[PDB]
Amino acid sequence: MLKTILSIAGKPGLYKLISQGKNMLIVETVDAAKKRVPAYAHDKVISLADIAMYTDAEEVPLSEVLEAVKKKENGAVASINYKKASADELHAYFAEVLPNYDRDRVHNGDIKKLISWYNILVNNGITEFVEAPALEHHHHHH
């Protein structure tokens, strides 16, 4: 479940935490190499277990709204690209499948941080977070 993937809003992207130490966290790059990297709690180390967005519907974790926008592209990578798209393009890409997003709670660059991890997600597959089969096949209940 959401515990192992740490979401990084700094220079790197996504990590897998194995163990915590009082200097450095023992993590793995979620990548093709998968190297053991010392993580430091300064480079915007957030839990992806924590990331959620409150919208017109219930409280939706970032993984489930990833599913909703990924549904469009059939499990491909993000065609938006956050480092080429305008701020208007960011919210309009989300509003293609979910136009019920608000601008009150969703205002903290929530889609922008999402696209940053979203390209990394499809890069190695991660595990599974969308009913389009990349590794497993999910069932819609959420």
TrEMBL record:
It holds the Pfam family DUF5606. Signal peptide: none annotated. This is Uncharacterized protein. Residues 2-48 form the DUF5606 domain. Transmembrane segments: none annotated. Residues 51-121 form the DUF6852 domain. It comes from the Bacteria.
